[PDB]
Amino acid sequence: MGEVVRLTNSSTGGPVFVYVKDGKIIRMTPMDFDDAVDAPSWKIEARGKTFTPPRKTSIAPYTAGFKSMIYSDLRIPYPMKRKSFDPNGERNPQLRGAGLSKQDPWSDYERISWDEATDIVVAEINRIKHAYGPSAILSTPSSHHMWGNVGYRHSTYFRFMNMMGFTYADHNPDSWEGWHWGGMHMWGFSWRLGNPEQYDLLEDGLKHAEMIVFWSSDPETNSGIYAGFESNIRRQWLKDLGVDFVFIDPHMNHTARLVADKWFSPKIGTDHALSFAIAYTWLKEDSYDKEYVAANAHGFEEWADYVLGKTDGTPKTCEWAEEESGVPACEIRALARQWAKKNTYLAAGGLGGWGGACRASHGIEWARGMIALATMQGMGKPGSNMWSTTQGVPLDYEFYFPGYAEGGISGDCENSAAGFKFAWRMFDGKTTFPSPSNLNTSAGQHIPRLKIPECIMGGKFQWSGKGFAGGDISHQLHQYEYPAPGYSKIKMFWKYGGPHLGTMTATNRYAKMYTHDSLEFVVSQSIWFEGEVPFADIILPACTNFERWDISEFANCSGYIPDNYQLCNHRVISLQAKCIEPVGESMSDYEIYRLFAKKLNIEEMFSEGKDELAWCEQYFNATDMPKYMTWDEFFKKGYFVVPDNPNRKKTVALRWFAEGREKDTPDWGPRLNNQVCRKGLQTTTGKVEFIATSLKNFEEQGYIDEHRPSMHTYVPAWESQKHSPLAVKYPLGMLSPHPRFSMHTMGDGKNSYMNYIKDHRVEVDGYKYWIMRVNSIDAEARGIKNGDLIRAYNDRGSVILAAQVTECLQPGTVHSYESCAVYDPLGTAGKSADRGGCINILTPDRYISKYACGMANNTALVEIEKWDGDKYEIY
């Protein structure tokens, strides 16, 4: 009926140009810059060359095929109601997921209007509040959300929920685990949940790098986060400069498969054995920065004695490490000597921190081991630092534009990074106001996301820390209980999405909690009918960001990751145009909340009379954008490439710390009161503490925790092959990192195009099965061949997978990505084998340590065999 129009929008996989015609999306593509209106790119001269990025953006796989998710047939059609659910009669809690238990989820629901769906939900809210109170209403979205700042969970969700309830199931620091619960005590960086600063490292690396050690790092796959393939050319440059790339990862990951000069496959949970043997070598050969350490380390003398085996009678030799990890002694020693004599950067994780190794049972020692190595080599000095090659791009750190983590329209200073700068800019205390929460706070009531099942089915729990404990090193040490004093047990559960079966730990328990009679009501506000959604009583259809207006910046998260847009080659700010009308009877989360506000008699206070677009303009004017172009002009253009700032003086990460001077980078910390004349790290001594003073106080106060000693030591992983009694029955070591062709659950299932990718899922007799990589020697020993359906199992459950026999795993180790979007039980829900591919049904739910309340997923012992077709309803 009309012509094609090029619009703009973005995603978690990068910004895109969207072509529309007659209300239909025709295609989505990477973005090309128009040099007539888009500012020039930065340039870096190093080792005789000139390095400048391509005048173009890049996208991730899951974004390239995103159109198939938007128009998915698993896309929730309209509000739905569980047939067996009667608000005023038999609620039949025990029938939640009944359809799923008979392999027909859809038949459990019937269609209802929006007016009725909300009428029902409102009646439950008001009943529960007046009888038990706002705390009786549990709710939680999850870690990731559809791209869009104004509509991100930190913004729209919090702004509405803070006005209605509620008990928040605060999120465990999943991505940071090890750095958060362990590394933090060693070097601070709480405002980054234990991760390191990365500013201006690209130019420093190009000028000085000779070697880079990628440890639990796969940049090509993870891109750090949200950055498509922006850094791919940077490693190309380093490669062509003669820099050696070494990979240490149980699985020969994708970055390694592309540019590895050497690959090591340590057994799961044994990395810290390698780092101890590397430090041992440095000590025996005097091959480390002694001067650096004398000035910046604390308790090094004692730590040194342990590494040498004086205090425990076991020198941490390369041979000792070989027997632990399977990695050849000579190669560990060779790497150590090369590392010492070369300008080596430690790429721990794919962001500069993180790394699957941190959320494993050895996650705490690995993170501290990483800090140890980097420290001994003098991080901060030219050609020596912790850098994963994904951040450090010379972008304009001075230009300010909010990340989603800064709260958007909620202004929640307690649960978003709004308190740092954006809150002050967005609200004026006159015409527009924030939405605080007097419950989602420490003295209020929240529960750990990782232990929701025990709280609902058990009615009680006690733990350490509240969600992201980034305020200070010791905030995570504070003790909480459930129910919180004076507050009520959970009666209702308002879910935003439903991915926990594939994303948490020992997930069968999450399927079981839904039928507990304590749960009076379960609402589900999601986009696709999958995962946990088929357990709800009421289902509300939410739309993707391509069906609403918003605004954002390429990969800009901010908050606990200050200035992370440095992951990109450019700072691209784009208007996320509403390209098409909401699909089916779905609506945006903000319009859903606006309808409830009207019903709860708080419409004015919640919306302030604004639609999503009006909030966008207000958001716009609270940034630095106006300095370059008005709202109108920006709306018209669709995107803006931030100009380069050639002059600003460079401040390399941690260099100020290496040189014993005041902190000069744009980092959000440490806070003044955590430093003596703003020098040194956030730790007490201002030094890297090998014997953490925070933990030493904790343990002397009575909190004894054997798996989290004050001194970084070799604590055997409690879920490893040689230290767990469990290995007798389950001899195979499993690690389950993030999905290659999906942003966690957003990409997999849903009948998307990604399901046809050879290395993503395998079709066998009409059904596309999840993949588990097995080493040829282990497969042969079990009669397993490529493409065979196998059963992965242990005491937690059974998962049906298609086998991929490969060499990219040391014999004895198996690999399978996590974040499966499809939960499809062969028998009763939560009690039988899954064939959807939820590998997390098999991961350990035990906290990393007694007081380290994080997930230890990447260290899981399992056993495999050809599947005899049984449903194994024994859980």
């Binding site: 593509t29 159109k67 498969r257 000069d261 993503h760 040829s776």
Partner: protein
């Protein structure tokens, strides 16, 4: 009469599948009158081949994105009975309507790039988004794969046969199944990664990795390759044709030598303790 050509660098494929997700985005929910009816889920106009070589721990893997070869001497054009035609720019296209009801078309392909669409009852395959190349409005002026890449694998160009031939020789470009004589206009760079094999090992002197050892590869008795071991004591001779070879190693005056058989498989000699 300038023609279209596509160059793929195997050493650069990382198998992220942006290409493939590229056709699907362009062809699964869309119809392009004159070029092709919507694509059938499951087809791989863009097929990325995967091949692992060697054995743990000195193994490796390489990928080969395989769209339609659009060869100069297209067999299915010669045997398609008018159901397939070659344009002046070199693009080989299946006539969406004339090809309907003919399963046999598929067998005329030496490469196996066409797929049968059940619902449409017609063979389908790579069109090199001719529908996009023919439109000025499409600024990129290149197929969806190439434009979707984030690894700089593709080099899409429109030039003369003289220019392309010169380039083929300067970069050593090659084609799949050259012996068939169809003359594909899709060339591969570093194709040896995918089609050939290697022999590797690690040299140790007195318990430690020995760097700088001199290694020589021989066939028939004459040197075919030489190299010095890196700091891990390893060497690697790739792009090897099937056959028997002799590896001679010299370190610290200490000599070692052994034979190796290459039969469509790469070999890892393990640790050589000198």
């Amino acid at each position: 009469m300038e023609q279209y050509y596509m160059v793929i660098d195997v050493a650069k494929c990382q198998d992220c599948n942006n290409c493939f997700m590229g056709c699907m985005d362009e062809h699964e929910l869309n119809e392009w009158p004159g070029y092709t009816a919507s694509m059938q889920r499951g087809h791989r106009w863009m097929n990325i081949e995967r091949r692992e070589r060697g054995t743990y721990p000195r193994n490796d893997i390489n990928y080969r994105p395989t769209p339609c070869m659009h060869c100069e001497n297209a067999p299915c054009v010669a045997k398609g009975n008018g159901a397939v035609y070659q344009r002046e720019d070199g693009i080989v296209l299946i006539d969406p309507e004339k090809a309907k009801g003919k399963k046999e078309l598929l067998d005329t392909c030496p490469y196996g790039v066409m797929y049968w669409n059940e619902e449409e009852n017609v063979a389908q395959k790579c069109t090199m988004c001719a529908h996009l190349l023919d439109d000025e409005s499409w600024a990129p002026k290149m197929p969806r794969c190439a434009h979707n890449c984030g690894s700089f694998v593709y080099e899409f160009l429109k030039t003369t046969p003289e220019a392309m031939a010169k380039k083929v020789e300067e970069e050593g470009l090659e084609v799949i199944k050259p012996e068939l004589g169809t003359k594909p206009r899709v060339y591969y760079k570093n194709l040896y990664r995918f089609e050939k094999n290697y022999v590797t090992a690690g040299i140790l002197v007195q318990g430690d990795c020995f760097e700088g050892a001199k290694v020589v590869l021989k066939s028939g008795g004459k040197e075919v390759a030489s190299a010095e071991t890196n700091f891990f004591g390893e060497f690697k001779f790739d792009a090897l044709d099937n056959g028997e070879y002799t590896v001679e190693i010299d370190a610290d005056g200490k000599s070692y030598s052994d034979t190796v058989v290459i039969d469509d498989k790469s070999v890892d000699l393990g640790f050589i303790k000198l």
